[PDB]
Design a protein around this ligand. Sequence first.
Ligand SMILES: Nc1cccnc1-n1cccc1
Ligand SMILES: Nc1cccnc1-n1cccc1
Ligand SMILES: [Cl-]
Ligand SMILES: [Zn+2]
Ligand SMILES: [Zn+2]
Length: 568
Amino acid sequence: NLDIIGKRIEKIKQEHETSWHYDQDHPYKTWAYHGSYETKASSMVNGVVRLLTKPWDIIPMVTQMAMTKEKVDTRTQEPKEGTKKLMKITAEWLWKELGKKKTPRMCTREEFTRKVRSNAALWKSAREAVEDSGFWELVDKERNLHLEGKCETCVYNMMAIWYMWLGARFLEFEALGFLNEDHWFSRENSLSGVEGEGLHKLGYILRDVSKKEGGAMYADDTAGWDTRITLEDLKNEEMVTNHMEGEHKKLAEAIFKLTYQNKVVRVQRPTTVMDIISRRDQRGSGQVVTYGLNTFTNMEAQLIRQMEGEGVFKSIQHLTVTEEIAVKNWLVRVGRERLSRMAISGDDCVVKPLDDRFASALTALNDMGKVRKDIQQWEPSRGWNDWTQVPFCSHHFHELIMKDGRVLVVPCRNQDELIGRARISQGAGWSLRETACLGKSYAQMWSLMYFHRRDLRLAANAICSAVPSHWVPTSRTHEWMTTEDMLTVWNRVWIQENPWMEDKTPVESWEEIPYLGKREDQWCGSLIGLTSRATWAKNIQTAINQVRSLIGNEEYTDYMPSMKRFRR
Ligand SMILES: Nc1cccnc1-n1cccc1
Ligand SMILES: Nc1cccnc1-n1cccc1
Ligand SMILES: [Cl-]
Ligand SMILES: [Zn+2]
Ligand SMILES: [Zn+2]
């Protein structure tokens, strides 16, 4: 406890020694409180996307999205010894499989610097600190302190997103960045994972899982996954260090011990004082390490749920000596096959188990604290009989046959959600040019991922017609972030580079690229058939001209005649 976090706490105490006060009216039960001190971000609308989607101005599901804890301050119980054993055996085996064709390695100041230049989500800005050299001296001090087994400045800031100072992020990136930078959770490497795979590949992956013999597809969400990470989970995650050596092992061990398995956080409370609180359990790391370790622990949880359904062990209360031999031998004999029956993206999963015994195999899942969302604790899971109805990564997936017989598996979600998000820009000081270029990024994403939705292909063509042809899409895989012809990009992604497409014959026109059935488009939220939508489509050039007149005398390209109706 206080020996590991005290130094961090002792340092913040002094930088505010003229405000420190052990407040007796503090709202924490499960978080340890240490003291307070005196201290003191809305969704803006994207005017270019909103002027080109007028029919949606009167649709509350779109317009309410731009307007405007219980779970964080809860406690998870210690799993039983059978559960703790199931996890340790499974984790040990999983780090070895993930490590068979990969080498753990430190990420570098050079790599870290390149990422800060490219606007990755990780002195005014980071760019400046990286150029400066005192920062790196500060980094060096902490780094040598971590080699000593002590921490001074690796403190979280709550807002649930856990901002640290850039120096702490580098030390995180140094030891643990390899998980993401070297694609440990790629499908090729982890078999369950989809890291780097892209939204145009997730549907094909779900359809490949569907091809396996077995029961329903299960897609159970965990209620507040990050808050249900136990200290036993953090200790199985720490076992990645068993595969490291030299400095790297030491540095990785310090991240896990000092920043993950012990945490110090500063919270804005309005009553305005800053609460220096600590706790051991729960997920609190950087987003990228959070994504990879969530994937890891989810793959582990789901293999164990699969073991329970298949009768590999009888009870979580305690594993017999022989049951350990059985688990290990299961993992050795069928482990890789069982991983291939899953698609796991952080806390999000789809599992096609051997049979439907999986549906009521709930003792390990509940005892690990991975409690299902929106279903009673002991009520069996409801599975999906058709891969095209399975939810994954906020989407479902359609099978769409081209006029030439080739098969597209395309991503889809309710259209209100897509238009509502396109109409929102985060941050201050956006110029008209920067707002336009963000609208162009949404438009090009729609042309590539959602071309099959009538409204989005028409709105995408309108935004690309309204924004100067050579302006570069911005956002403060992502193939839509380019100035290349979207037809050329479409042909690369869907035909040339698509391993599910045998016939590589290029498409020569947007008109060869199909839509969903008209009824299926309305089911997924299309306005096709409404008078508002008909007036919008008929008069689109008037909307395009409005936005061109606001931006001014620039070079523009008409993309509307790419669609049959506007082709005279
Ligand atoms: N790759 C990585 C590792 C550790 C922390 N942060 C990152 N990151 C976040 C956005 C882009 C890169
Ligand atoms: N992957 C995902 C999840 C939630 C929202 N949007 C996305 N997306 C849309 C296009 C590409 C990615
Ligand atoms: Cl179904
Ligand atoms: Zn530190
Ligand atoms: Zn759909």
